[PDB]
From Swiss-Prot:
Residues of the full protein shown: 1250 to 1600 of 3859
Source taxon at top rank: Eukaryota
UniProt remark on domains: The PI3K/PI4K domain is required for the recruitment of HAT complexes, and the MYC-dependent transactivation. Although it is strongly related to the PI3/PI4-kinase family, it lacks the typical motifs that constitute the catalytic site of PI3/PI4-kinase proteins, and lacks such activity.
Subunit structure: Interacts with MYC, E2F1 and E2F4 transcription factors. Interacts directly with p53/TP53. Interacts with GCN5L2. Component of various HAT complexes. Component of the PCAF complex, at least composed of TADA2L/ADA2, SUPT3H, TADA3L/ADA3, TAF5L/PAF65-beta, TAF6L/PAF65-alpha, TAF10/TAFII30, TAF12/TAFII20, TAF9/TAFII31 and TRRAP. Component of the TFTC-HAT complex, at least composed of TAF5L, TAF6L, TADA3L, SUPT3H/SPT3, TAF2/TAFII150, TAF4/TAFII135, TAF5/TAFII100, GCN5L2/GCN5, TAF10 and TRRAP.
Family as reported in the entry's similarity comment: Belongs to the PI3/PI4-kinase family. TRA1 subfamily.
Subcellular location: Nucleus
Protein's recorded name: Transformation/transcription domain-associated protein
Phylogenetic classification of the source organism: Eukaryota, Metazoa, Chordata, Craniata, Vertebrata
Function, as annotated: Adapter protein, which is found in various multiprotein chromatin complexes with histone acetyltransferase activity (HAT), which gives a specific tag for epigenetic transcription activation. Component of the NuA4 histone acetyltransferase complex which is responsible for acetylation of nucleosomal histones H4 and H2A. Plays a central role in MYC transcription activation, and also participates in cell transformation by MYC. Required for p53/TP53-, E2F1- and E2F4-mediated transcription activation.
Annotated disorder: Developmental delay with or without dysmorphic facies and autism: An autosomal dominant neurodevelopmental disorder apparent from infancy or early childhood. Some patients present with intellectual disability and renal, cardiac, genitourinary systems, as well as structural brain abnormalities. In some cases, the phenotype is less severe, has no systemic involvement and is characterized by autism spectrum disorder and/or intellectual disability, sometimes associated with epilepsy. Affected individuals manifest variable dysmorphic features. Deafness, autosomal dominant, 75: A form of non-syndromic deafness characterized by late-onset hearing loss that involves mid and high frequencies, and progresses to encompass all frequencies.
Length: 328
């Protein structure tokens, strides 16, 4: 529970090393000592609001560590007053606005709340075994997963991955929590890089969520974004938007093989307009998608007319030379 992040992480790593060398588990090693944690896991004698931010993060990380062990060293029970207080503080920290935290004196001087929010989210995701909590925890995890902050988004994805290891989540819950984002992406201008990153995280965690019609909508949006990229190039983040959208396809299991032809056509059109082959950032995600349907790609490229057309032949040769193109 040390406030010093280096010493805390080295102690946790040291306990894991000791468990690996001895062959015992971390819980067995920590079990006779755990008396020394009784005041800290969960924090009893002080409210976290009174404690400095570094101490708060250290206590939350220590709680996450003790609760994440395979046999839990401490099991939180919401019937215990201190445990409910700690859980409520974690929920408030995850849910509250940045301005509501800033007015609190302990946070008032942090350069960024984001490390505190990540530590709180990790401490909340560790409570996957309490059946009463799950709805609020899932709501907080989805709020973090939908955060415009990149670091908070990645932390939300990781915490959701950690939470799903010990708790189920229903498809209805996913659809209800993701409905605000899915409704907004009807127009192509709404597809910022953050939105596509959030969709990527959702499809990584929950592959079932997205179906064929979503892939068609993403294809239409990608066509419009590639047209915008070409217009911008002719006039002189859209390239990253395009690349992320293409990368989204190979992570959706419901993406049909029929997408290969329009995807190749739009990438070829954009590259020909921009006159780029080596510097094209569309090849890396496209080859990931093509390797998922290698027979369709080979049959499309190995057509006589397509092998005569020098541009398509060049694109085929470039794909076949790639490291990931073993299926092709």
């Amino acid at each position: 529970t040390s406030p010093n992040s280096t010493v805390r992480k080295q102690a946790m790593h040291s306990l894991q090393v000791l468990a690996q060398v001895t062959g015992k588990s971390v819980t067995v090693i920590m079990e006779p000592h755990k008396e020394v944690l009784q005041d800290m896991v969960p924090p009893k004698k002080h409210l976290l609001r009174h404690q400095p931010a570094n101490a708060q993060i250290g206590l939350m990380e220590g709680n996450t560590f003790c609760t994440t062990l395979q046999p839990r060293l401490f099991t939180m029970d919401l019937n215990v007053v201190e445990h409910k207080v700690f859980y409520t503080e974690l929920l408030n920290l995850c849910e509250a606005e940045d301005s509501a935290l800033t007015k609190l004196p302990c946070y008032k001087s942090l350069p960024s709340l984001v490390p505190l929010r990540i530590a709180a989210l990790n401490a909340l995701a560790a409570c996957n075994y309490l059946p009463q909590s799950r709805e609020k925890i899932i709501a907080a995890l989805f709020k973090a997963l939908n955060s415009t902050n990149s670091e908070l988004q990645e932390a939300g994805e990781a915490c959701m991955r950690k939470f799903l290891e010990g708790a189920t989540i229903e498809v209805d819950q996913i659809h209800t929590h993701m409905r605000p984002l899915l409704m907004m992406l009807g127009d192509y201008r709404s597809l910022t890089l953050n939105v596509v990153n959030r969709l990527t995280s959702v499809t990584r965690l929950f592959p079932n969520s997205f179906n064929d019609k979503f892939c068609d909508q993403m294809m239409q949006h990608l066509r419009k974004w590639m047209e915008v990229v070409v217009i911008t190039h002719k006039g002189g983040n859209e390239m990253k938007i395009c690349s992320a959208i293409i990368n989204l396809f190979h992570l959706i299991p419901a993406a049909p093989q029929t997408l290969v032809k329009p995807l190749l056509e739009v990438v070829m059109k954009t590259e020909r307009a921009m006159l780029i082959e080596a510097g094209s950032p569309f090849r890396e995600p496209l080859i990931k998608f093509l390797t998922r349907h290698p027979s369709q790609t080979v049959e499309l490229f190995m057509m006589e007319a397509t092998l005569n057309d020098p541009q398509w032949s060049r694109m085929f040769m470039s794909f076949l030379k790639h490291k990931d193109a073993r299926p092709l």
